Structures are given as C-alpha cells and as structure tokens.
C-alpha cells in the first residue's frame, strides 16, 4: 500500500511510537532484557497494529462517526469502549486460537500476543488514527510504519543492553535509571528525520 511515504518516515523517526510518544514503555523497558523475545514481540505488535488500525477506522466511519447510522445522531463518545473491546477481541481469540494453520508461525509469534492485548501502544495508534483525520486511503501506511518503528526500537534497545554487560554503572543507577538514560539517548539518535522531499 502507498499513499505518501513522508507519513511513514515521520512516524518511524521523529514521532516514534516508543522513543517519542512513550507508548508501551512498561513492557518496552522490561522485555528488552534479551533479543530473542523482543524480536517476536515486535513482529506481533507490527501485525496487530497493521490489522487493527484500518479495522477501527472502518468501524468508526460506519458506526461511531457523527451521523453514519441515522441523521442527527452521534455515537462518538463510545470510542474508548469500542476501541478497547475491538482490540481485545481481534487478538484474544481471532489470533490466539485462530492461529492453528502455520504451527511454526504460531509457536514463533503467537506466544507473544497475550501480553500485547492491553498494551497501550495499540490503543494509542488507534487513538491517533482517530484524532488525526486519516482514512482508509491511508489504510495501513500509518499502522505499519508505527509498528515497524516500535519493533525496531525495542530490538535496538535489547541489543544495546546485551552489549552493555561490560559497563560499570554506579550501584544507585543500576537498572531502571540506566535503562531510562539509554532510552533517552536512543531517542536523541532517532530524532534524525521529519519528512521527505519526494
């Protein structure tokens, strides 16, 4: 799919899902102890974002958007309930139990989706798709660009932390403190793109 890649580049780099919007930190800073787990977790997040964002776009446009069900009626205040319920349903069953075909795929990334079912990154992606007047013309550009950015950031942090076994951080700064410092530096590095001149 392709609408314009200046949208994808921006969302990957400057407004990154993890390193800029702080979305998903509670597991981004915890599961990043090892690369093997983070890789599958990021791939699962990628697929879940890519599928969920357009689906919630369609549901919002068909039911919750002002009018669109009957004239003079607006159900837009049910956005939070509907989005959270749809996110929960589209994963908890329709992948967790759906993935019977491709057993080597299910045992590869199907083991990580139970943790992401209520991760704030998914809900934030849908909320951004709504807050900014996107469309199914975008369809998947935004969701895919955000998911790939999240996976890339978490994998990079896991690699950095694995390489960091040789460090000698002060005792009081060991753990959460140095992880926060590393994340800040990673964002500083990730701040290098904002658009595209074709």
């Amino acid at each position: 799919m392709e609408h314009y890649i200046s949208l994808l580049v921006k969302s990957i780099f400057i407004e990154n899902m993890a390193l800029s919007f702080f979305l998903g930190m509670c597991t981004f800073l915890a599961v990043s102890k090892k690369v093997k787990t983070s890789f599958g977790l990021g791939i699962a997040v990628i697929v879940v974002l890519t599928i969920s964002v357009p689906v919630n776009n369609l549901v919002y446009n068909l039911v919750l958007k002002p009018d669109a069900l009957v004239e003079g009626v607006d159900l837009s205040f049910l956005n939070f309930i509907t989005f959270i319920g749809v996110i929960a349903a589209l994963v908890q069953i329709l992948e967790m139990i759906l993935d019977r075909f491709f057993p080597p795929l299910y045992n590869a990334l199907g083991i990580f989706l139970p943790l992401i079912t209520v991760n704030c990154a998914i809900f934030g992606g849908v909320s951004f798709m709504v807050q900014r007047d996107y469309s199914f013309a975008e369809s998947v550009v935004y969701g895919f660009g955000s998911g790939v950015g999240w996976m890339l950031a978490i994998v990079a942090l896991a690699g950095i932390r694995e390489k960091m076994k040789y460090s000698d951080v002060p005792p009081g700064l060991r753990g959460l403190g140095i992880t926060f410092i590393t994340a800040g530096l990673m964002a500083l590095g990730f701040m290098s793109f904002s658009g595209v001149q074709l």
Partner: peptide, 16 residues
C-alpha cells in the same frame, strides 16, 4: 439508542 449500541457491542464481544 446510545445505551443500546454500547450494550450490544459489549455483549457481542463477550459472546465471541
């Protein structure tokens, strides 16, 4: 209708 839509969405998600 505002109540009904929320009710039906929740019940559909639960029965699924």
């Amino acid at each position: 209708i505002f109540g009904v839509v929320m009710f039906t969405l929740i019940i559909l998600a639960l029965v699924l």
